[PDB]
Amino acid sequence: GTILIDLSPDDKEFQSVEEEMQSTVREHRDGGHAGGIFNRYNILKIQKVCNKKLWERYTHRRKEVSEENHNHANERMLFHGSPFVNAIIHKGFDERHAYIGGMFGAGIYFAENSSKSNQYVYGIGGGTGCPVHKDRSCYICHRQLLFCRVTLGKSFLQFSAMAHSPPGHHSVTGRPSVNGLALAEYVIYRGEQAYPEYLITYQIMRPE
């Protein structure tokens, strides 16, 4: 039941999503090994992801979390990169999209930094890079990320350099504790706590 609606670059909604993509790029401690070397993206397309059933699945769970947390869903817009972006937008997030080996346990991981999620487009650690050139830093091939609506509820704070949420919590927040420029990363343990709102198609751009 999924349909993808293209946003025009003139649409304020395109512009605000692009600006969150671009403004949350940072340098990574791997010097670009996983995600490539770039300071910015070439945004090719931004599509709104419309699926009534998946939306209602999300809002039902959101109300549950909200009622468990003094009427506060603690909803964020966060990035998600994955080899499975195309199954996600059709079938929703579930246990099969979880990073089993992630540092906060087997859950589904999201980033404030678009460049962090970009490191997972071709798999963990960038995998073997793009399908066509086997290049983790490919400047040619078209990549895709999701910009997702995520319900955090009461989030467990982890200071730091599917399973269940910690008892009494609905998510985990990975707070950066060494790299002062890194933004937070988050983990949910129920696929119903995220909705893939935007599909963004882009290239990373070679610095000049």
Ligand SMILES: O=C1CNC(=O)N1Cc1ccc(-c2nc3ccccc3c(=O)[nH]2)cc1
């Ligand atoms: O567990 C595996 C093994 N191969 C694979 O594609 N997965 C699924 C997977 C999907 C997304 C991510 C992912 N992990 C992150 C960790 C931190 C921040 C962002 C992300 C992010 O955007 N995506 C990790 C693993």
Ligand SMILES: [Zn+2]
């Ligand atoms: Zn390529």
